[PDB]
Symmetry: D2
Subunit: 123 residues, 4 copies
């Protein structure tokens, strides 16, 4: 359900994700990062399964933030890939990749991997 | 650098990636997969660095495809994260994560990782 | 410290890791998996930093289990890569890759990624 | 399949991997990196499937190197997970995770991911 995804979410490090889920499967919003070379809000775009399986299956989704806004440019982009699990503790569990632009010779150290869990506060 | 990202790209397995790079960092287009539970095109959306560095560095980008269109629904989504390297032979070098919607019991086996290289040939 | 790593550990799904850290940087022991096509114990081998930085830095380590013992063969191998953090709640936080042997055409779906946290019980 | 893993291998960047595959699943040998805060050889240890499938499947394997030897200590460890494909041109296709020991504050930026392909040339 788009509505269940729409809202304000925060992860374990204190970053803020504001998102709207559109009926066509689109995700749009802003990301505020608690860590890294970042300040203020960044534009996010993603896609989610707008017709998930009933069961107790999660809803698969993903989004990207490129770390450039009008105040700073970190020359990197993070994608989060995971699933939304709806309940009375609604969570988005993800794994992420962070790639920095590098020269050809430093490209072996361009991509960080980690995982983030998001807890919903507001719609 | 910048606008050379717009175009039709192909990865090592024959999947086709058709993208438009907007001036302010948006990536929009369609993807058609050569593998998996997919048929025809799927919508993608992403972001890229619209003011990259001026030393020899690549352009950082990323995009997502949710594998649902009017024909099929695999209940999964892939994100690709990587960089664009322009030149006489431009390439987009990426690593990707494919997450399927699972029950909580099967959540440990929900995410595949791999890598794709796209060129204009 | 090798001693601090040596012991019995369990992760969030109920798998058991028994390990000895050798003074040359070697890790040897057995793994018992709570999930997957697995039964009874499997041999593990790894390496760790036997001279870590003092600070409050973790100790980097990694190990491999190939999922074949005398009772079952899953034709796969998992590597865990992470760090040991010593404290009165001693933890090993890892990220893992699980690769299955596949044909050339199915090789795009050969590798799973996830993360595991281990809590120490015994030496 | 099986014993063809023993040998000297090289990846795309010139790193050299010298391995012995034991009969019961052990991998033992040395690694010398072409990149990073490393010099000379480092000990590796791993495991592989000693009875793989008989259909067209690769041999699953994995190994770890902690980047400390008598010369240097990078306080990090890499694990490679992948499969061996034998034939006229054998290859080991892998993906890897490099974790550095960090403080708790920097734990989000502790792990790099990439991919390496090893051949006997």
């Amino acid at each position: 359900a788009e509505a269940g995804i729409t809202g304000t979410w925060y992860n374990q490090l204190g970053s803020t994700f504001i998102v709207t889920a559109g009926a066509d499967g689109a995700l749009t919003g802003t990301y505020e990062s608690a860590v890294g070379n970042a300040e203020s809000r960044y534009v996010l775009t993603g896609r989610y399964d707008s017709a998930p399986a009933t069961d107790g299956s999660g809803t698969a989704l993903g989004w990207t933030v490129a770390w450039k806004n009008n105040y700073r440019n970190a020359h990197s982009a993070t994608t989060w890939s995971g699933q939304y699990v709806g309940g009375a503790e609604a969570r988005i569990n993800t794994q992420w990749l962070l790639t920095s632009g590098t020269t050809e010779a430093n490209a072996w150290k361009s991509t960080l991997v980690g995982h983030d869990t998001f807890t919903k506060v507001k719609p």
